Structure 1
Amino acid sequence: SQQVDKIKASYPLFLDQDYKDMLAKKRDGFEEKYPQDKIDEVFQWTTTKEYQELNFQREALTVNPAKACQPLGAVLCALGFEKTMPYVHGSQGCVAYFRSYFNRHFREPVSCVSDSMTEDAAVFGGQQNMKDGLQNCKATYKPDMIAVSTTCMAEVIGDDLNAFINNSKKEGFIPDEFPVPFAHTPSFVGSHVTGWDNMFEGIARYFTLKSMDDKVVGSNKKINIVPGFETYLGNFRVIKRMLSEMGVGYSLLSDPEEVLDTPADGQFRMYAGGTTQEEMKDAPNALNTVLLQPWHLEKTKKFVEGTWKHEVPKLNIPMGLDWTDEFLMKVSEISGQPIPASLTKERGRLVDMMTDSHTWLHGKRFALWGDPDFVMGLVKFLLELGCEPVHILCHNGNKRWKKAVDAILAASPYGKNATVYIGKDLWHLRSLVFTDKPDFMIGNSYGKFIQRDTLHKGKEFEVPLIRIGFPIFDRHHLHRSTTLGYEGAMQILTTLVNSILERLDEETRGMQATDYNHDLVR
């Protein structure tokens, strides 16, 4: 029964007395539910150190992972080029899931096609499917370029994408000059960042391998920028803005910002902006190549150093204060352009915020997780702010990354209690935050559930979540934020300090109980 004037959605409609009685009758009559005391006992046992010791003994079971498969990153990398339709050689459910994931994150249309391989393709293969898919994709959704990736199914059957595409071109199914790069992206190896790396390396190979004879390093006076797997449009915009302010000539070799932020003016645009094929062809002529996220760009770095002969600098992700300064200085050294006064003023403004907010960020324990480069930059920034990470997690991190993070932590007096984990899911993190309670979590929307469990134990044990990463599903338009450079550091500092202050305000709102510390000025 809903009143017409005040219509209730599922909440709080299902809190009505009749609905509560119906649910109670359903629970008692037929659910055969365990007694509530047993449930509480099991929960309390799960919140203990013994349960953590059992949890970290896991070898085969993974609960609530914090990563995705390679083809997702491959699709994102493909979306970064001009009129390049991401085409995945494999089953269609994958592509559907990729599209749903990206639509839920960016809240924008995402274009991705599949050849819809089926049980017939398991035995025979995926040659005819590849030919038909290429022809239909070029006829119906006209692109200037088609990027070909693979799902696990195509990898297990051991397809031969190069041979299939060559046969398709040969047997009158597509023009022999139509750009069709490809990459092998097994979903059971690495994660989505590895898929992005493989896709970018395949595209660069396809566009530059056979024309290195006439390429002179530095003949165009430009610096190539490879952003890697990035999910914030603000980072793409801020990198270009800073490079333009320095006056350096640049070529962003992956720019999906335009297609992922198209305006709603009454018409639908399937393609928008992106890196042109001419830029990819002229890339070997650049002065150098700078990798924004050097950890999940190993294959790209190998290809660039081996083939393009560019000497890629060893630069960390430009997150925080020190690494942004290092990136700016390295770019100035490579291009010769002096650092303008606007960037100096912006750095000073960031230092002003750091000095103003330092009394609230000091001695705050944070538990983070996410991509390797993003997590490393966030840890560096937290160490710079005086915050002490306690639980640094990265599901798809390797041992060298852990060594680097440990080296970073050991260089500061605030990495004393920090523990790095590589290969642990969010159940391990739940146990860690239950037994060694931090002040806040910093991560994607999945930690949203952890904050619920920590609330069930008690209000005093709750660990608030700060949504900085990929994917974010329960907050609108957070993908427009910035995390790279000085602007991205200012936004992150503001988010952290305001979250701390909001939690403090919530804790001190009880009237005549804890409201004595409900200060107007903080």
Structure 2
Amino acid sequence: SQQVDKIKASYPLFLDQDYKDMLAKKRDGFEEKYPQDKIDEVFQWTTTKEYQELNFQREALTVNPAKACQPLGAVLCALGFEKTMPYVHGSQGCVAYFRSYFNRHFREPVSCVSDSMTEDAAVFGGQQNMKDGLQNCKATYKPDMIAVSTTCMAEVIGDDLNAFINNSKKEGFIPDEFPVPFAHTPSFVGSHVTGWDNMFEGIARYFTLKSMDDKVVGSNKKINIVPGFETYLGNFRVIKRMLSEMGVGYSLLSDPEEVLDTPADGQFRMYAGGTTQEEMKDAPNALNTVLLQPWHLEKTKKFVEGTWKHEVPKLNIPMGLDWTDEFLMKVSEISGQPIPASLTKERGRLVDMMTDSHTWLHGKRFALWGDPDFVMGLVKFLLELGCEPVHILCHNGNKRWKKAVDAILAASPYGKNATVYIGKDLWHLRSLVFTDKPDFMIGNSYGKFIQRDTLHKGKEFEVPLIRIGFPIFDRHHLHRSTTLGYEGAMQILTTLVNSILERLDEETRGMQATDYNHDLVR
């Protein structure tokens, strides 16, 4: 029943006695449910070190992964160029999923097309799909460029994207000069980040390779910045802000921050901002190219060095105090621009926040996950804060990365309790936060189910989630935040000290019980 002035949604409606009875009748009468005591027994068993031993021996089963597939990244790369349509050659189900996954994180339109390969194409190839697909998209959606990617179907049947695009130009489906860069992005090799790298390499090769004979490294006097898979608007924005502050000429190659944040003013804008084709053509003429997230940009590095002849600096992701410092000094070096007074002040205001908050941050234990570059920067910054990154998980990380992070850990007293896990997933991490309980997890929204599991063992075992990463679906607008630069470090510090203090206030809110320590001032 409903009372029309206090209508109840599913929670708390189904807590009403009649619903509670009906659901009890349903299980007892028809579900043949395992008895609660057996359930409790198995739940306690899944928190043990024994379950953990067995869990970590898995070879074939993956449960709750912390990565997605290559074309998801390829679409995000494509979206950063001026008026281009991401196009994924293969089965359409994939595009409906890529679009929805980013729609949920940015709360924005995400435009992308498929060329709907069906059963028949699986036997005869998808050539006609490319032909009609390109023509239809160019006519209906009017992009200045189409960036072609691939689904696993089109990968397994081995469709030569290059031949098909050339044959579509040959047959007059799209004009010969229309930009159609491509990349093969197989979901069974690496992850979403690899798709971003493959796609960017594809686009850079397309505007540059057969034009190198007139490019003079340095004549436009700019530095190129390649962001990598990036899902925080504040990160694209802070890198541009810092370089403009230094008077440094730059080219942010693949910049989606306008299309991922259009105004609600009475009209929908399908395309907005982005890197222009002219910037991509001129990008050899830059002094150098900096890769903001180098561990998933290896193919782009090989291409920028090998063909553009740029000596890509050995820079880590500009996350935390030290690595934002190194970034700024290398930019200074390359451009001959001095690091301005404003950035020196900003650096010191971050250092000031560190001195003010260090007592609550000291020795706090964290479990965390995400993409390789994001994770290593968060590890670095946690060590700088005097915290312990005890469980560092990166499902899609590789052996050399793992070595680089264990090195960073070995260089600090605060790394002594930490272990790096590559190829492991969130059900693996679930074990680790029960058997070697940290204080908090820093992760994406899938972490909420691990927090729910720890709370079921009991309040003293609950490990709270701090949502930093991708995807964040159960909170609004956190995609606007920053994790890079001194700005991003200020935001992360504030979020960590205040998660600690909120949790401390929840534990000391017991009247006459724990509220002796429920301090007004902290």
* Structure 2 residue 295 is matched with structure 1 residue 283: no
Give the drift of 1:230: 0.3
SS in 2 for 1:30: helix
SS in 1 for 2:296: coil
Give the drift of 1:172: 1.1
Using the alignment, how far apart are the partners of 2:371 and 2:210 within structure 1? 33
**Which string of whole-angstrom CA distances, capped at 9 and with x for unpartnered residues, describes residues 411-438 of structure 1?**
0000000000000010000000010000
**Which string of whole-angstrom CA distances, capped at 9 and with x for unpartnered residues, describes residues 98-153 of structure 1?**
00000000000000000010001100110001100000000000010000000100
Aligned to 1:39: 39
Using the alignment, how far apart are the partners of 1:519 and 1:92 within structure 2? 56
Using the alignment, how far apart are the partners of 2:246 and 2:103 within structure 1? 35
Using the alignment, how far apart are the partners of 2:309 and 2:5 within structure 1? 71
**Which string of whole-angstrom CA distances, capped at 9 and with x for unpartnered residues, describes residues 296-328 of structure 1?**
000000000000000000000000000000000
SS in 2 for 1:295: helix
**Which string of whole-angstrom CA distances, capped at 9 and with x for unpartnered residues, describes residues 140-193 of structure 1?**
000100000001000000000000000000011110000000000000000000
Give the drift of 1:196: 0.1
SS in 2 for 1:315: coil
Using the alignment, how far apart are the partners of 1:487 and 1:425 within structure 2? 30
SS in 2 for 1:308: coil
**Which string of whole-angstrom CA distances, capped at 9 and with x for unpartnered residues, describes residues 390-421 of structure 1?**
10000000000000000000000000000000
Query: Residues 16-415 of structure 1: matches in 2 within 5 Å?
Result: 16-415=16-415
Using the alignment, how far apart are the partners of 1:368 and 1:30 within structure 2? 41
Using the alignment, how far apart are the partners of 1:154 and 1:283 within structure 2? 31
User: Identity over aligned residues, as a percent?
Assistant: 100
Using the alignment, how far apart are the partners of 1:311 and 1:30 within structure 2? 68
SS in 2 for 1:466: strand
Using the alignment, how far apart are the partners of 2:42 and 2:241 within structure 1? 54
Using the alignment, how far apart are the partners of 1:214 and 1:244 within structure 2? 28
Using the alignment, how far apart are the partners of 2:101 and 2:496 within structure 1? 26
SS in 1 for 2:213: coil
Using the alignment, how far apart are the partners of 1:131 and 1:83 within structure 2? 21
SS in 2 for 1:3: coil
Using the alignment, how far apart are the partners of 1:389 and 1:167 within structure 2? 53
**Which string of whole-angstrom CA distances, capped at 9 and with x for unpartnered residues, describes residues 61-117 of structure 1?**
000000000000000000000011000001000000000000000000000000010
Give the drift of 1:468: 0.2
SS in 2 for 1:391: strand
Give the drift of 1:13: 0.5
SS in 1 for 2:413: coil
Using the alignment, how far apart are the partners of 1:33 and 1:293 within structure 2? 49
Using the alignment, how far apart are the partners of 1:346 and 1:220 within structure 2? 29
- 4+ runs deviating over 3 angstroms: none
**Which string of whole-angstrom CA distances, capped at 9 and with x for unpartnered residues, describes residues 33-69 of structure 1?**
0110000000001110000000000000000000000
Give the drift of 1:453: 0.3
Query: Structure 2 stretches of 5 or more lacking a match?
Result: none
Give the drift of 1:290: 0.4
Using the alignment, how far apart are the partners of 1:291 and 1:32 within structure 2? 56
Using the alignment, how far apart are the partners of 2:26 and 2:488 within structure 1? 51
Give the drift of 1:285: 0.1
Query: Structure 1 stretches of 5 or more lacking a match?
Result: none
Using the alignment, how far apart are the partners of 2:448 and 2:284 within structure 1? 44
Give the drift of 1:512: 0.9
Using the alignment, how far apart are the partners of 2:157 and 2:47 within structure 1? 44
**Which string of whole-angstrom CA distances, capped at 9 and with x for unpartnered residues, describes residues 247-288 of structure 1?**
000000010000000000000100000000000000000010
SS in 2 for 1:261: coil
Using the alignment, how far apart are the partners of 1:100 and 1:381 within structure 2? 32
SS in 2 for 1:264: coil
SS in 2 for 1:414: helix
SS in 2 for 1:496: helix
Using the alignment, how far apart are the partners of 2:388 and 2:36 within structure 1? 38
**Which string of whole-angstrom CA distances, capped at 9 and with x for unpartnered residues, describes residues 425-473 of structure 1?**
1000000001000000000000010000000000000000000000000
Give the drift of 1:6: 0.5
Using the alignment, how far apart are the partners of 1:507 and 1:131 within structure 2? 63
TM-score (norm 2): 1.00
SS in 1 for 2:415: coil
Using the alignment, how far apart are the partners of 1:269 and 1:172 within structure 2? 29
Using the alignment, how far apart are the partners of 1:342 and 1:254 within structure 2? 27
SS in 2 for 1:86: strand
Using the alignment, how far apart are the partners of 2:362 and 2:93 within structure 1? 47
Using the alignment, how far apart are the partners of 1:133 and 1:170 within structure 2? 15
TM-score (norm 1): 1.00
